[PDB]
Each structure stands twice: as structure tokens, then as C-alpha cells.
Design a protein around this ligand. Structure first.
Ligand SMILES: [Cl-]
Ligand SMILES: [Cl-]
Ligand SMILES: [Cl-]
Ligand SMILES: [Cl-]
Ligand SMILES: [Cl-]
Ligand SMILES: [Cl-]
Lengths: 84, 84, 84
């Protein structure tokens, strides 16, 4: 289950069936792996009411950091976002 | 044509070219099949100002049900959503 | 870099790694080609606080033109949008 969401805004799904959600009112991005019962919080930092999310074929995750007027990305496995 | 939309928020497109739209102010999700002149309303139920939509490779449709703080999905052909 | 964004809302990424963003408060859609240092503004016209974006396998770009209650698209290479 996704839990503790606040007014979620965006959603994306990768080729593995992992679903990524911008949890807009909690200033975070969460994901739920296919056949997992437990969400994870992606290691973005400093998000402000994030609104949309996409995931490319390499599993890189892209987020419109709505409140900070910027776009950020995280490579799969990475813990350090890049600002586009 | 898409018609009767109210402040649509999200859009997705599948490998068949079917376009899915969250019709935010009408509390519904609509789709337009590639080379169709007529939209369909997907059989989600109880949506509250839905904001984003995605579609996986099996045609499963995922929606951030923004006002209800939850994520919902419908398998292709299914009439019964699942809350994630 | 993406620059001059205002409260960006949606994001999509194509199979080439080109990232497309709805630059919501500037009434436009921007894109950044993979390994490019410079954004481009897509030739949509008349957008009103656009909210979501998607890109199909042929590079056609779809935008929910939120304020105008409509969905618009541009074929790759085209300078003339179509209203869906
Ligand atoms: Cl909100
Ligand atoms: Cl907001
Ligand atoms: Cl609105
Ligand atoms: Cl709302
Ligand atoms: Cl806004
Ligand atoms: Cl708005």
C-alpha cells in the first residue's frame, strides 16, 4: 500500500511495474515496487510541492519541483539528485 | 474529440496511441482510442479532482486520486478499480 | 539547463532521453534534448496554464491545456498543433 499520501499529484510506471507517485503535500516522491507491500521514499532532497514525475528506460526518475521552479532527477540506485 | 473537459490536469499515451486524460474538474478519467472519433469514460469510481495518469505496457491505468489522498488502478478490460 | 521556469507542473521523457516539461506559469512547454545544454520552447500556441505532458513512441507530444479545457498535440518536427 501507498500510505500517508497528501494530495498526490503525479504518477508514473516503469517497465518493471514499479509505480512512482509525487506525494505533493508531503514534499516527497514515493514508489512501490511491483509485488511489494511497502512503499519507499525516494532520496530527493529539498522538494517543494512537487507536481509531476516520469521514469526513463534506465530507471532514472524526473520530477517537476513545482515550488522551486526547477526539474530534478535521480539515476536508479543513486542517492544524489541532479538539478536539470 | 475530447469534449466536455473541465480543467484537465494529466495525460498519458499507450503504445497503441490511445490517449488517457484526467478530467480533473469532472472527477473522471477519459480516453480516446487511436483513430476513434469518440471518447470513453473509464470505469473508475469515487474520484475526487484526479490529477495525474499513467499507463503500463499491459494497458493498466494508474491515477492519482488527488482529493482522496490515494492512488487507484484499473487493468485493461476491468470494471473494478483497485486502491494501491 | 532548464531556466526561466515558473511553477512547472508536468514532465515526460522519450526513448531518446529528451525531457519535456509543462512550464505552467509561463503558458508554454519546454524540452531539453539528451546531452544538450540548451532548452527549446515547443511551438504550441495559445496555451493557458498547461498542466500535464506525454510523448508517444513517434515523438508526438500531448499536453493538457488546463485553462482552455482541451488537449493539444504536436507531431515531431511539426510547427502546427492539433486540438484533440
Ligand atoms: Cl493541492
Ligand atoms: Cl501547489
Ligand atoms: Cl484547477
Ligand atoms: Cl485541486
Ligand atoms: Cl500553481
Ligand atoms: Cl492553475
Amino acid at each position: 500500500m501507498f500510505t500517508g499520501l497528501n494530495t498526490p499529484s503525479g504518477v508514473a510506471v516503469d517497465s518493471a511495474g514499479t509505480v512512482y507517485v509525487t506525494d505533493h503535500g508531503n514534499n516527497r516522491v514515493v514508489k512501490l515496487a511491483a509485488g511489494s507491500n511497502t512503499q519507499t521514499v525516494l532520496p530527493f532532497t529539498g522538494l517543494n510541492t512537487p507536481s509531476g514525475v516520469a521514469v526513463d528506460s534506465a530507471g532514472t526518475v524526473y520530477v517537476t519541483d513545482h515550488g522551486n521552479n526547477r526539474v530534478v532527477k535521480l539515476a536508479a540506485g543513486s542517492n544524489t539528485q541532479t538539478v536539470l
